[PDB]
Structure formats: structure tokens, C-alpha cells
Amino acid sequence: SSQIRQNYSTEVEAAVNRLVNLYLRASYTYLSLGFYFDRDDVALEGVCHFFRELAEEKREGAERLLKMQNQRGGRALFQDLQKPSQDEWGTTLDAMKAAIVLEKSLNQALLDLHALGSCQADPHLADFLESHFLDEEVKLIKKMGDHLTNIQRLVGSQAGLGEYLFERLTLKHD
Amino acid sequence: SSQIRQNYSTEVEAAVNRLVNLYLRASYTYLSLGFYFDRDDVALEGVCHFFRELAEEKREGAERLLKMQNQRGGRALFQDLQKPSQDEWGTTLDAMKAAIVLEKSLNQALLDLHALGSCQADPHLADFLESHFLDEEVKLIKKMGDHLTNIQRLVGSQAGLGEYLFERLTLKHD
Amino acid sequence: SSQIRQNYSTEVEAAVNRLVNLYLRASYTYLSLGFYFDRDDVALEGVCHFFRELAEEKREGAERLLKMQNQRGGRALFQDLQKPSQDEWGTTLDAMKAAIVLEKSLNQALLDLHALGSCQADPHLADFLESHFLDEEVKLIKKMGDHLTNIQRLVGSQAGLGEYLFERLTLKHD
Amino acid sequence: SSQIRQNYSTEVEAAVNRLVNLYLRASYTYLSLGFYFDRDDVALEGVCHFFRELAEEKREGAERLLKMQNQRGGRALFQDLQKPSQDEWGTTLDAMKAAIVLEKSLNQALLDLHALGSCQADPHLADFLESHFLDEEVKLIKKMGDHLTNIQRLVGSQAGLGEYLFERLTLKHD
Amino acid sequence: SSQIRQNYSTEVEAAVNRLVNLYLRASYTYLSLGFYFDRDDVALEGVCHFFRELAEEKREGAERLLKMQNQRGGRALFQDLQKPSQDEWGTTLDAMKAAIVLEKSLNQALLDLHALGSCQADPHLADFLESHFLDEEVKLIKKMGDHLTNIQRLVGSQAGLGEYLFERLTLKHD
Ligand SMILES: *C1=CC(=O)N(CCNC(=O)c2cccc(O)c2O)C1=O
Ligand SMILES: *C1=CC(=O)N(CCNC(=O)c2cccc(O)c2O)C1=O
Ligand SMILES: *C1=CC(=O)N(CCNC(=O)c2cccc(O)c2O)C1=O
Numbered sequence: 001s002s003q004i005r006q007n008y009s010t011e012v013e014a015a016v017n018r019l020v021n022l023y024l025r026a027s028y029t030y031l032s033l034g035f036y037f038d039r040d041d042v043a044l045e046g047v048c049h050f051f052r053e054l055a056e057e058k059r060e061g062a063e064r065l066l067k068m069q070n071q072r073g074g075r076a077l078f079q080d081l082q083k084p085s086q087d088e089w090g091t092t093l094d095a096m097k098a099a100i101v102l103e104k105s106l107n108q109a110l111l112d113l114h115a116l117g118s119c120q121a122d123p124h125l126a127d128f129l130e131s132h133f134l135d136e137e138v139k140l141i142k143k144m145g146d147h148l149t150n151i152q153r154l155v156g157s158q159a160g161l162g163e164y165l166f167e168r169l170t171l172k173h174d
Numbered sequence: 175s176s177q178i179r180q181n182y183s184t185e186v187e188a189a190v191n192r193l194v195n196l197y198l199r200a201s202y203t204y205l206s207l208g209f210y211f212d213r214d215d216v217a218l219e220g221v222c223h224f225f226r227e228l229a230e231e232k233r234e235g236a237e238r239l240l241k242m243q244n245q246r247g248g249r250a251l252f253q254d255l256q257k258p259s260q261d262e263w264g265t266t267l268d269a270m271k272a273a274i275v276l277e278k279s280l281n282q283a284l285l286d287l288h289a290l291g292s293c294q295a296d297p298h299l300a301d302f303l304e305s306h307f308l309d310e311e312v313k314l315i316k317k318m319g320d321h322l323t324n325i326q327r328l329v330g331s332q333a334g335l336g337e338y339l340f341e342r343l344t345l346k347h348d
Numbered sequence: 349s350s351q352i353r354q355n356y357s358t359e360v361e362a363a364v365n366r367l368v369n370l371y372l373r374a375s376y377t378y379l380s381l382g383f384y385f386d387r388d389d390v391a392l393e394g395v396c397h398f399f400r401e402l403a404e405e406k407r408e409g410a411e412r413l414l415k416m417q418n419q420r421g422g423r424a425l426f427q428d429l430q431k432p433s434q435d436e437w438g439t440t441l442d443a444m445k446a447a448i449v450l451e452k453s454l455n456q457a458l459l460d461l462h463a464l465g466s467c468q469a470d471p472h473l474a475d476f477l478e479s480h481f482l483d484e485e486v487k488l489i490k491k492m493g494d495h496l497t498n499i500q501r502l503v504g505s506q507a508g509l510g511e512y513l514f515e516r517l518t519l520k521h522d
Numbered sequence: 523s524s525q526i527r528q529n530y531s532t533e534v535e536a537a538v539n540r541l542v543n544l545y546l547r548a549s550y551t552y553l554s555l556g557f558y559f560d561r562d563d564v565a566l567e568g569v570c571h572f573f574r575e576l577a578e579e580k581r582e583g584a585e586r587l588l589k590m591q592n593q594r595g596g597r598a599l600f601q602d603l604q605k606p607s608q609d610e611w612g613t614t615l616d617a618m619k620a621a622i623v624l625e626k627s628l629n630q631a632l633l634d635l636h637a638l639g640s641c642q643a644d645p646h647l648a649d650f651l652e653s654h655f656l657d658e659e660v661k662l663i664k665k666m667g668d669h670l671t672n673i674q675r676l677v678g679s680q681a682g683l684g685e686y687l688f689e690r691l692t693l694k695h696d
Numbered sequence: 697s698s699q700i701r702q703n704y705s706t707e708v709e710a711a712v713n714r715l716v717n718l719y720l721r722a723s724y725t726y727l728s729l730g731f732y733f734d735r736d737d738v739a740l741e742g743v744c745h746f747f748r749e750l751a752e753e754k755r756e757g758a759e760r761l762l763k764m765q766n767q768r769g770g771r772a773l774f775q776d777l778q779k780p781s782q783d784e785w786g787t788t789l790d791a792m793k794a795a796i797v798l799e800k801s802l803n804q805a806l807l808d809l810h811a812l813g814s815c816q817a818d819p820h821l822a823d824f825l826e827s828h829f830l831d832e833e834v835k836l837i838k839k840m841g842d843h844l845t846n847i848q849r850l851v852g853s854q855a856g857l858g859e860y861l862f863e864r865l866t867l868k869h870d
């Protein structure tokens with residue numbers, strides 16, 4: 001247990017368990033966003049697929065953190081997963097704004113954990129976040145910003161038409 | 175005849191012949207919907223193809239019911255096929271609303287026959303409808319509802335443009 | 349919304365949202381079981397892999413239920429996901445007993461929802477559970493019972509040796 | 523010489539030559555561990571192969587450090603390689619405990635050199651250790667801890683039987 | 697040097713070095729146009745790709761001119777590359793108008809150098825420009841004019857919608 005643990009502070013161990021909770025909460029928020037856009041009275045398949053893929057990416061991030069907790073000899077502790085902030089998510093524009101708010105809060109949590117790791121002279125934690133999380137988040141936040149600008153340009157004065165065209169011509173669908 | 179019939183009531187036999195008539199009427203309604211959208215003054219190929227494929231699916235449902243009538247020892251009886259309710263079907267939105275009304279009436283007829291079969295303790299009929307009809311209808315009704323929501327969002331204030339874009343970007347065409 | 353909903357009671361809609369919560373809670377319990385057996389001071393890879401695969405199967409069950417909620421016109425509502433019942437799971441025998449208790453509680457919830465669906469004459473719900481859930485649960489519960497009997501026969505008077513051999517020779521590992 | 527050297531302190535250059543010595547000493551310790559388990563009166567092939575592969579991994583680490591010394595313009599200096607701490611290594615459990623002590627001392631030396639590099643604002647050294655050494659050591663230390671727990675569970679009251687089974691069923695052999 | 701130079705005037709040699717500067721300035725202007733359309737608050741990928749490909753075509757033109765300078769025995773001389781005329785490029789319509797102004801100025805410089813070469817009875821220079829530059833520029837200017845007409849027809853009264861559709865349906869993108 002303590003049989004392998006070396007240079008791994010209790011502060012980092014607890015912040016990693018909190019980061020796992022935040023990634024699994026973000027995966028749950030994306031599950032709810034994906035099934036909202038699969039409602040027959042919303043019916044934007046490309047938007048459903050975009051959020052369901054992010055639910056899987058965030059679960060994968062949590063699982064990588066949990067593998068790392070165990071590689072360093074810390075102990076995974078799970079807490080309840082709070083339900084998402086909304087039950088209905090509005091338009092694609094509202095949803096994409098909520099998603100970029102969620103990603104910036106995950107990014108800030110990564111940055112905060114990097115700072116704590118660097119303060120405690122834990123370079124394996126710092127490099128783990130730099131290699132597997134920080135650029136994934138910057139790439140994702142840039143894609144969401146590019147989508148938000150396109151959705152915004154499409155609203156104009158024909159909001160239904162623009163929402164359809166963005167789903168059909170930007171987002172991946174069957 | 176009576177050489178194979180077992181646990182198959184006269185009530186179920188007659189309701190199956192009525193259900194065959196309803197499926198063949200729905201296939202005829204879809205034949206008329208498909209050729210209306212092939213008119214040179216309507217000219218929405220994807221909508222024509224969507225309804226012509228449903229005419230074939232409903233004929234196939236009728237043929238499965240007729241095969242089942244004979245597997246159970248009942249006797250297929252055919253009645254006249256009433257012509258469709260309309261000679262011209264309006265816009266894609268009008269047509270898709272008429273199609274979901276038609277499917278909900280077929281679905282209710284399936285549900286009614288399931289109830290009659292379960293009341294008469296005929297589990298082969300009940301499982302036949304559950305395996306081959308009830309989820310096909312729920313899947314189709316959900317696809318029609320998703321289309322209706324998309325067509326509705328596209329009308330807005332440029333109805334021609336929206337009808338074209340839905341046909342070009344949602345429905346399958348050459 | 350109500351544009352497609354037919355023969356789908358508010359009672360079934362709410363029980364489906366509760367069943368989704370139970371499946372996602374069982375997936376979370378299995379995530380915790382999988383990472384406990386990946387601890388360096390537990391270190392039973394085959395047991396970790398057995399529970400991590402069940403975490404994915406239970407998430408998949410929840411996602412099938414949510415797809416069905418939307419196919420029938422109900423509205424997915426999510427609640428908090430309660431953390432698992434334990435933070436540490438003991439031996440493989442303790443873990444496998446907790447898993448069969450969890451599966452029998454999911455099974456009973458399926459049976460209860462089947463009864464509610466049959467009472468409300470909702471054969472699409474009943475057949476959905478029969479086709480995609482009831483035999484999966486009976487197969488899984490039988491595999492867990494076969495494992496429990498093997499783990500029990502292996503304890504005898506050399507419990508460490510038996511736990512190792514079961515992991516190495518029954519469970520799938522690298 | 524000084525023709526390419528830039529931002530590379532004498533302190534880092536000497537600590538890299540000491541780290542090369544520690545990696546080549548650890549490779550020699552593993553050569554001795556591998557041939558001890560190939561003795562006809564020890565005869566645990568999987569344990570021999572596990573340590574002989576680590577002798578090659580540690581030589582490879584030393585060679586990467588030496589390539590880096592030259593890429594940065596420092597000068598490789600070699601010292602004597604002290605013989606291993608033991609001539610006979612006891613049981614697999616004793617050997618695996620000595621190996622995890624050796625790896626934690628190499629890991630601490632990596633961490634110490636990272637700190638010196640970060641203090642002297644040498645990010646190429648810091649990233650070199652983070653990319654090629656720190657996670658390799660954390661992965662290896664976690665595998666050794668998982669093995670130690672399995673070997674410990676196998677001793678119980680039949681130590682010979684457990685040592686055989688671990689070699690046969692965990693470690694790679696012909 | 698003068699070892700190979702034949703029929704190659706100092707006037708042509710200096711005008712070729714000025715033409716290289718103009719092509720490398722046009723490549724830099726296109727680099728800036730490409731990265732402007734990759735901004736998250738502009739986000740038109742097809743427009744970014746169209747200008748980044750032109751940055752490479754103009755660098756290639758400069759490199760062909762420089763190879764020719766050396767084949768004829770002249771001496772390449774480089775001057776500073778003036779930064780582009782704008783830091784932000786407005787809409788796709790503004791950008792495409794600036795691009796056709798830039799191409800007509802490169803074309804006029806080609807025509808001027810052709811005239812100087814023909815006046816000095818330098819047919820290898822004249823044929824070099826005719827074979828590798830004059831029709832490339834006429835093809836490119838015609839494609840830009842076709843794009844400008846399409847972008848103009850799309851503005852109408854819904855400028856955002858038209859800018860999106862042109863990028864999605866004319867320009868090449870992922
Ligand atoms: C409080 C702990 C501490 O030392 N301090 C600085 C940690 N360093 C960084 O945050 C940092 C960020 C990016 C790259 C680096 O190399 C780096 O050291 C605190 O926050
Ligand atoms: C009148 C006949 C009868 O018994 N009664 C109930 C038939 N049962 C169902 O309709 C039903 C629906 C869905 C699943 C079941 O298992 C089921 O028994 C009548 O309608
Ligand atoms: C209360 C509602 C009701 O009618 N009742 C019976 C529902 N039927 C079943 O539970 C059942 C179970 C298995 C197969 C069947 O066909 C079936 O009808 C209630 O629980």
C-alpha cells in the first residue's frame with residue numbers, strides 16, 4: 001500500500017479523488033445533455049452524438065485518474081455523484097454554453113491540482129496532468145468555442161433553420 | 175385445417191384478418207403518399223422514397239400476419255381495401271402528420287389484438303406481436319416524431335426553403 | 349413529445365427513471381469494486397477485470413433504458429447517484445457476495461417494473477424487459493453463484509492460496 | 523563541446539553521471555538476481571526471466587541518460603560499478619522486496635535530479651526525466667507491489683507450493 | 697557565376713528578386729488570413745484551409761523563381777518581408793476581396809516582368825513566366841471571382857447564414 005507509495009502527499013491523494021468526482025459528474029451531465037437532444041421534441045441527432053461522446057471521454061478521464069491513484073499508492077474514495085444542473089437544456093446554443101462553462105470548471109480544477117503538485121514537488125503528478133489532460137481540455141474548449149461562434153452566426157433571425165443546419169452540416173451524424 | 179389448429183380462438187382469427195386489412199390499407203395510403211411527392215409540381219424525392227419504403231414495410235407486415243394465420247390453422251379472409259383518405263397530401267409537414275396518425279392507429283390495433291390474445295391465453299399470438307410488430311411500430315413512430323420536430327423547426331418564416339432543406343439533408347435520396 | 353406517446357403511463361415513466369438510477373448506481377458500485385481489486389495491496393487482476401466489465405454492462409443497461417424512455421415519449425429525469433455501500437470490499441468472496449446481493453436487487457426491480465407494465469397493459473415495456481434484461485440478469489446471477497461456490501470450495505484452510513488460484517484459473521486476465 | 527552546451531549546469535552534468543552509475547549498478551544487481559534464480563537448487567525460471575529483463579531495462583535507462591549527457595554537451599564520466607549487495611537472494615519474496623527497495627532508491631534519485639533541474643531552470647532535463655523515467659518507475663514499482671502482495675498471500679503455511687505457483691501462473695516463462 | 701550567365705540582364709535579375717519578395721509577402725499575407733479564420737471567434741475552417749493552401753502556393757512560386765535566378769546565373773538577394781496590410785480581416789467577403797486585390801497585383805508584376813524580358817529579348821524568362829505563372833494566376837483569379845460572386849449572393853439579408861453555408865458547401869473542410 002504504503003508498500004509502493006513514494007513522494008505522494010495526502011493533499012494530492014484527496015484532490016485526485018475530488019477530481020475523479022468532478023469528471024464523473026461532467027460525464028453524467030453529458031449523458032443528460034445527450035438524451036435531451038434525443039427527445040422526439042428536440043431531435044437533433046448530431047448534438048445528441050456530440051454530448052454522448054463527451055460523456056464517454058469524461059468517464060475515460062476519471063478512469064485514468066483512478067488508475068493513477070492506485071499506481072501511486074493512494075486510495076480511491078468515491079462520493080455521491082450530484083445530478084446535473086438542469087433537467088432540460090434549451091437550445092443547442094444554451095447547451096453548448098453550458099458545456100463550455102463545465103469544461104472551464106474542469107480545466108480550472110486540473111490547473112489547481114497541477115499547482116498543488118508542483119508546490120509539493122510531485123513531478124509525476126504534474127507530468128501526468130500535462131500529458132493526458134491539459135491539452136485535451138484546451139483542444140476541447142477550442143472546438144466548443146468554434147461551435148459556439150458558428151451556432152451564434154446561424155441564429156440571426158431564423159433560429160430553427162440555423163439550429164438544423166448546424167446539426168446537419170457541422171456535427172457528425174448518421 | 176382444424177388438423178393443426180390449437181389454442182387459436184375465432185376472435186383472434188377474425189381480428190388478425192382485420193389487422194391484415196388495416197396493414198394493407200396503410201400500405202396503399204403510403205403508395206399514394208409516395209407518388210404524390212413524385213409529382214412534378216411537388217418534386218421532393220426523399221419524401222417520395224420515405225413513403226414508398228413504408229408502403230413496402232406495411233405490405234410485409236400484412237404478409238407476416240397472413241403467414242401466421244395459416245401457421246395457426248386460421249383462414250385468411252380478405253376484404254376490400256378502402257382508398258386512402260386524401261387524393262393530395264399537402265406539404266411534407268401535412269403528410270408526416272397524416273403518417274403519424276396512421277401509425278398510431280395501427281399501433282392501437284396491435285395493442286388491442288395483444289390484449290385480446292392475452293385475455294384468451296394465446297401466448298404465441300402475444301409473443302408474435304411483441305417480437306415482430308410492437309417495437310417496429312414504436313421505432314417508426316419515434317422516427318416520424320423526430321422528423322415532425324425537424325420539419326416544424328424549418329418552417330419558421332421560409333417554408334419552401336425549409337421543405338427543400340429537410341428533404342435534401344435528412345431524407346435519403348439519390 | 350406527447351406527439352408520439354401512446355399507451356405509456358406516468359407510473360411506468362417514473363419507474364423507468366428510478367430503474368436507470370439503480371443501474372447507474374450498480375455501475376458505480378462496480379467501478380469501485382474494480383479499482384479496489386487493482387490496489388497494490390489487493391492485486392487480483394482477474395477480479396478487477398470482472399468488476400470493471402460489469403460496470404460497463406450496467407451503464408449499457410441504463411443507456412438502453414434511457415433510449416427506450418425517449419422512444420416511448422417519456423422524459424428522462426436524473427437523480428443523484430449515491431456512492432457505493434462500502435469503500436473497501438474485503439476478499440473476493442466478500443465482493444462476490446455483495447455483487448450477487450446487488451444483482452438480485454436489480455433483478456427484483458426489473459420484476460417489479462414488469463409487473464407494473466403488465467398491470468397497465470403495456471406489452472412493449474414488458475417485452476422490452478423480457479428481451480433485453482431478464483435473461484441477462486438470470487445468466488449473470490447464475491455465473492456469480494457458480495463463482496461463489498468455487499471461491500467457497502477454495503477457502504478451506506488456505507484462504508490466500510485459494511484466492512490466488514481462483515483469480516488465476518477461473519477469471520479472465522492478461 | 524562547449525560548442526553546443528547551453529543552459530546545462532555543472533551540477534546537473536555531475537548528477538547525471540551519478541545517475542548513470544546508479545542505473546548500471548541496478549542492472550548489475552538484476553543480472554545477479556536473474557542468475558541466482560537459474561541455479562539448479564533455486565530453479566524458478568519465471569523469476570530468472572523477470573530479473574534478467576529488468577537488467578536490460580536498467581542498462582537501457584543508463585544508455586538513454588548517456589545519450590542525453592552528450593546531446594546537452596556534458597561529458598560522461600564513469601566510475602566503478604559496485605558489486606550487488608548480496609551473493610544469494612533468498613526466496614522470491616526476499617528478492618522482490620530487495621527489488622522494490624532498489625527501485626524506490628532509483629526513483630528517489632530521479633526525483634532529486636528533477637528537483638535540481640527545476641531549481642536551475644533546466645526544463646529540457648526536467649521534461650526528459652518526466653517523459654522517459656518517472657512513469658516507467660511508477661509503473662514498475664506498482665507491478666512489483668502487486669507481485670509482492672500475491673507472493674505474500676501464497677506463503678501462508680505452504681511456502682514451497684506458493685513459490686512454485688506464483689512462478690508458474692504469474693510470471694512469464696517458457 | 698558569370699561562368700554560366702548568358703543573355704540575362706541586370707534589369708531582369710533585380711526584377712526577379714523583387715518578384716520573389718512580392719510572392720513571399722503574399723505568402724505571409726495568406727498565413728495571416730488563414731490563422732485569422734482559425735480564431736475561435738471567427739471559426740470558418742474551410743476559409744482557413746483555403747488561405748493556408750494559398751500561403752503554400754505562393755511560397756512555392758517564390759522558390760521556383762529563386763531556382764530560376766540561380767539556373768540563369770543571377771544572384772538571389774532578399775529584402776525584408778513587410779507585414780500584411782491588416783491584422784484582422786473582417787468577413788469572408790472582405791477577405792476574398794483582399795485576396796483578389798493581392799492576386800491582381802502579383803499578376804500585374806508578372807506581366808510587367810514578362811514585358812521587360814520580351815523587351816530585352818530574353819525568351820527563356822518569358823517562357824518561364826508563361827509556363828509556370830501566368831495561367832496559374834489567371835486560374836486562381838477566376839476561382840476567386842467565382843467565390844466572390846457566390847459569397848455576394850449569399851449575404852442578401854442573412855449574412856451569418858450565408859457565410860456559414862459558403863464555408864460548409866463550397867470550401868473544402870474536414
Ligand atoms: C504554491 C506551490 C508552489 O511552489 N507554487 C508554484 C508551483 N509552480 C507552478 O504552478 C508551475 C506552473 C507551470 C509550470 C511550472 O514549472 C510550475 O512550477 C504554488 O502554486
Ligand atoms: C381482458 C382479457 C384479460 O385478461 N385482460 C388482460 C390481458 N393482459 C394484458 O393485456 C397484458 C399486457 C401486457 C403484458 C401482459 O403480460 C399482459 O397480461 C384483458 O384485456
Ligand atoms: C397487478 C397488475 C396485474 O394485472 N397483475 C398481473 C400482471 N401480470 C404479470 O405479472 C405477468 C407475469 C409474467 C407473465 C405474464 O404474462 C404476466 O401477465 C399485477 O401485478
Ligand SMILES: *C1=CC(=O)N(CCNC(=O)c2cccc(O)c2O)C1=O
Pocket residue numbers: 117118119120121122123124126636637638640641642
Ligand atoms: C530548489 C530549487 C527550486 O526552485 N526548488 C523547486 C523546483 N521545483 C520542483 O521541484 C517542481 C516539482 C514538480 C513540478 C514542478 O513544476 C516543479 O517546479 C527546489 O527544489
Ligand SMILES: *C1=CC(=O)N(CCNC(=O)c2cccc(O)c2O)C1=O
Pocket residue numbers: 810811812814815816
Ligand atoms: C518594351 C520592350 C519591348 O519590345 N516591348 C514589347 C515586348 N513584347 C511584349 O510585351 C509581348 C507580350 C506578349 C507576347 C509577345 O510575343 C510579346 O513580344 C516593351 O514592352
Ligand SMILES: [Fe+3]
Pocket residue numbers: 118640
Ligand atoms: Fe516548475
